[PDB]
Design a protein around this ligand. Structure first.
Ligand SMILES: CN[C@H]1CO[C@@H]2OC[C@H](OC(=O)N[C@@H](Cc3ccccc3)[C@H](O)CN(CC(C)C)S(=O)(=O)c3ccc(OC)cc3)[C@@H]21
Ligand SMILES: [Cl-]
Ligand SMILES: [Cl-]
Ligand SMILES: [Cl-]
Ligand code: NA
Ligand code: NA
Lengths: 99, 99
């Protein structure tokens, strides 16, 4: 699709067997999802944005379906105010910015 | 151009006659720039990101060049960790997300 930016670019995702809404976010290096359980191992990480840092759990090799396109990658889980799909997964669905 | 996301989507901007680097950020509603001087009056705004809220100075109707495209619009100035071009000016340069 082509997504204009008059509104937030929100899409439906499926992760951990759950459907959620997330923001397609080119300014995010990594994908950060609100607190939820995921299977497998994880390690702690700090990530920073506007406001400062939050502690997250880093899960590797997680499959996510983004607007109907399957991708695999690292997913950070923690107290983000919004679910964010960042570049590590946007690349895998072939997403580009065009102007 | 068509910009892939394997690297940060950094571009050159020009504001107040200075060149700066900024991130094209579809997850940002607003454009937020590191401390600098801008002409005219400002209004208060609080913006929230991953690690909480910050106070910024809101300058309206500021001329800014972004990757060679002219925009004139609102710029927020404050302690952001990186300069961010948000949807308010991404729409002015005609940017879309595509996959
Ligand atoms: C709520 N208001 C926010 C949205 O619109 C306003 O505009 C400015 C601000 O937007 C944001 O902070 N947006 C966030 C994404 C975002 C969106 C919403 C809440 C929090 C974060 C942004 O797209 C991604 N952020 C990084 C940039 C600040 C460099 S981040 O969420 O902090 C982030 C940092 C490291 C990551 O991996 C290492 C992954 C993500 C304001
Ligand atoms: Cl859960
Ligand atoms: Cl990854
Ligand atoms: Cl590619
Ligand atoms: Na894993
Ligand atoms: Na002004």
């Amino acid at each position: 699709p082509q997504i204009t930016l008059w509104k937030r670019p929100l899409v439906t995702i499926k992760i951990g067997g759950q459907l959620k809404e997330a923001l397609l976010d080119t300014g995010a290096d990594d994908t950060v999802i609100e607190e939820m359980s995921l299977p497998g191992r994880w390690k702690p990480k700090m990530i920073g944005g506007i406001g400062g840092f939050i502690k997250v759990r880093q899960y590797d090799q997680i499959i996510i379906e983004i607007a109907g396109h399957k991708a695999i990658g690292t997913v950070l889980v923690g107290p983000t105010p919004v679910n964010i799909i960042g570049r590590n997964l946007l690349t895998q669905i072939g997403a580009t910015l065009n102007f």
